[PDB]
Amino acid sequence: ADTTPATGLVVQQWEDKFFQEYLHDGGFKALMGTDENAVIQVKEDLSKKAGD
Amino acid sequence: SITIALVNRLNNAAVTGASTLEGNEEDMTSRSLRIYVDKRRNAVRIAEISEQR
């Protein structure tokens, strides 16, 4: 006699955020740089010029 | 389509003398030419990588 809600009237909520599967980047992004001491050298000259 | 018209010349022999002209007239002739229009197209498609190269 506690006036419970109907079985189909129990509201369920869905989160609008999502989880992402973890993928290892290997730390390569941390080693990228334009300086002469960087392990991975980044060349962005073709971004403003034309060529393959 | 659009239709153009041509009117042929009269080549009947003249009704000479007092001969009656009523009923003995000449059948004027006309010709038509129908010209159709159509759509002609041509295109060139270029890839992004091809544009960069």
Description of the molecule:
This is part of a larger assembly, with 2 copies of chain A. Chain A has 52 residues and is largely without helices or strands. Helix content of chain A is 0%, strand content 8%. Chain A has strands at 32-33, 40-41. In chain A, strands 1-2 form a two-stranded parallel ribbon. Chain A is elongated and about 80 Å long. In chain A, 0% of the residues are buried. At the A-B interface, loops of A face loops of B. The PDB classes it as virus. The entry lists the keywords Cyanophage, Virus, Capsid, Major capsid protein.
Number of strands of chain A: 2
Shape of chain A: elongated
Q: What count of helical segments of chain A does DSSP give?
A: 0
Helix content of chain A: under 10%
SSE class of chain A: little secondary structure
Q: In sequence order, what are the helices and strands of chain A, one letter per element?
A: EE
Largest interface, per-chain counts?
A-B, 3 and 3 residues
Major β-sheet annotation of chain A: 2 strands, parallel
Instruction: List the quaternary state of the chains.
Output: part of a larger assembly
Radius of gyration of chain A: 27 Å
- Report, as a whole number of angstroms, the end-to-end distance of chain A: 77 Å
Beta-sheet strand percentage of chain A?
Answer: 5-15%
The strand line-up of the biggest sheet of chain A is: 1-2
PDB class: virus
Keywords: Cyanophage, Virus, Capsid, Major capsid protein
Entry title: Cyanopodophage Pan3 capsid
Chains A, B: Major capsid protein
